[PDB]
């Protein structure tokens, strides 16, 4: 009824993501590109190298848009989100929360509009610290935060509004939770699944305190946030009952657009950061580029992206080395398919070894080492790339690539506006080999002046 790809026999201190994606390319080496991890009798067939990979998500993209089961399900429910949602749902709502993120029925203010905004509160709050050192982790975490509150209330917040800080200790609970390493099943368990559960109800229980206050103003002919917005497709799409659109769902989807959209966000910040002080002549000419082209007065802004080759590519490659995510989430396929020499049953988890792609030798020479030329022809122009996923590929693509990539350009650009970065390490030591997680690339703790600009 179906045949899986041959792997190793099945039931296969401390092991991390880094180390998962690093075992899984050892067994390519064996097994080929297409092979099959058993777990007792759950088959995960695992996808690697661009070929497979660009085979199955682009070129039979709709027979692998489904969501893995992960780890585990949680009977708090998260599956009428997007992240961990599927079939129809999925289909409805990421279609939705894809537009409302492109400017249709949001107000007139753009997405743009808000990542700028923030862009000046940060680096406000930037030069509090005196130019004495900082650890950028709790600033760098704020602004991504705030940028989906944004979309999702219209208002972001001061960066002392307790409603914030609690909203964003909730968030980091969650993180030292799940970036927690694995063991055969992963490390966690002992007092921590229950308060996963606690904090999801709070989060929930929060954006429904606002959703009450939404309906209170609710106006077909002036939406302005996510929420407003939503409650809009609820009432055009009714008597079309039941709805893939309700409360239910707002309330998962929102949660979720925190959820994915901060700490990605942020830990990429933070190593995008770290990688400026370890490499002070890329940030040297970055930090020109940025003179030639934006000077001090103005916000930087997305029509400078493109006049700006050698800081495309730098974001491009902090994307790219850094590896956020080895493993991108897991898949599944939708229905049973013939995929190459193999029939995957309906059901079968998926799981895509981004390492593999990001970190090719062929299109990425030298792909260890951190390099801005990566993204560059010879002649230093900005290199597009085939095997550019940070943010996966197919129909489950990143539903925020185009913000994330907003909050990365906006963001490292004003912080290179106003200020030099003055490692306290010498960088020709500073160690930048990321700690050890449950399932993404995070960098190590370090610090950093802020220095106001001078030349
Ligand atoms: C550097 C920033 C980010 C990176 C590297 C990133 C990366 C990714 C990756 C690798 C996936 C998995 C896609 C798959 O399952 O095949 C993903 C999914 C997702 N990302 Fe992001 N993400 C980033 C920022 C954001 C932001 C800012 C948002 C807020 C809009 C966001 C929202 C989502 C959502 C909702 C999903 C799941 C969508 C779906 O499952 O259909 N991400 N992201
Ligand atoms: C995109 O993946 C994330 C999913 C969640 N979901 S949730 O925490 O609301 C839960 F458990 F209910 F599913 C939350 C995330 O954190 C805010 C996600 O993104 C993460 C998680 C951990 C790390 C680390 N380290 C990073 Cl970089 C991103």
């Known amino acids: 009824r179906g045949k899986l790809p041959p792997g190793p026999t099945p039931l296969p201190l401390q092991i991390g993501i880094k180390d998962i994606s690093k075992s899984l390319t050892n067994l390519s080496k064996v097994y080929g590109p297409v092979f099959t991890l058993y777990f007792g009798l759950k088959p995960i067939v695992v996808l690697h190298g661009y070929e497979a990979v660009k085979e199955a998500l682009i070129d039979l993209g709709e027979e692998f848009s489904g969501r893995g089961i992960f780890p585990l399900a949680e009977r708090a429910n998260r599956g009428f989100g997007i992240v961990f949602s599927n079939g129809k749902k999925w289909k409805e709502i990421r279609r939705f929360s894809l537009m409302t993120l492109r400017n249709f029925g949001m107000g007139k203010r753009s997405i ?95 954006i429904l305190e606002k959703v009450k206050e939404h309906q209170e103003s ?35 989807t929102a949660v979720d657009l925190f959820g994915a959209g901060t700490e990605t966000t942020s830990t990429t910040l933070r190593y995008a950061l770290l990688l400026l002080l370890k490499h002070p002549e890329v940030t040297a000419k970055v930090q020109e580029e940025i003179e030639r082209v934006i000077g001090r007065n103005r916000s930087p802004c997305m029509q400078d992206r ?23 989430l897991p898949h599944a396929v939708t229905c049973d398919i013939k995929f190459r020499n193999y029939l995957i049953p309906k059901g079968t988890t998926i799981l895509i070894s981004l390492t593999s792609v990001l970190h090719d030798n062929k299109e990425f020479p030298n792909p260890e080492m951190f390099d801005p030329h990566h993204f560059l022809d010879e002649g230093g122009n900005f290199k597009k790339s085939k095997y550019f996923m940070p943010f996966s590929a197919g129909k489950r693509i990143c539903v925020g690539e185009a913000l994330a990539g907003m909050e990365l350009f906006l963001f490292l650009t004003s912080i290179l506006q106003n200020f030099n970065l003055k490692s306290l390490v010498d960088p020709k030591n500073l160690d930048t080999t990321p700690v050890v997680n449950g399932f993404a690339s995070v960098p190590p703790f370090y610090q950093l002046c802020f220095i106001p600009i001078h030349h």
């Not at 914030?164 to 939770?177: A, R």
């Not at 302005?224 to 079309?240: A, G, R, T, V, Y």
């Not at 700006?308 to 991108?328: C, F, G, K, N």
């Open 112 to 206: 743009e509009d808000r990542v700028q905004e923030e862009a000046r509160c940060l680096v406000e709050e930037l030069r509090k610290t005196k130019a004495s050192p900082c650890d950028p982790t709790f600033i760098l975490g704020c602004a991504p935060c705030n940028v989906i509150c944004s979309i999702i209330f219209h208002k972001r917040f001061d960066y002392k509004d307790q409603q914030f800080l609690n909203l964003m200790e909730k968030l980091n609970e969650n993180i030292k939770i799940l970036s927690s390493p694995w063991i055969p099943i992963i490390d966690y368990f002992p007092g921590t699944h229950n308060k996963l559960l606690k904090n999801v109800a709070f989060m929930k229980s929060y």
């Open 218 to 252: 609710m106006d077909m002919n002036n939406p302005q946030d996510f929420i407003d917005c939503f409650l809009m497709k609820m009432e055009k799409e009714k008597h079309n009952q039941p709805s893939e659109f309700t409360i239910e769902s707002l309330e998962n």
């Open 306 to 328: 493109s006049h700006m080759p050698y800081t495309d590519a730098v974001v491009h490659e902090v994307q790219r080395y850094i590896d956020l995510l080895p493993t991108s």
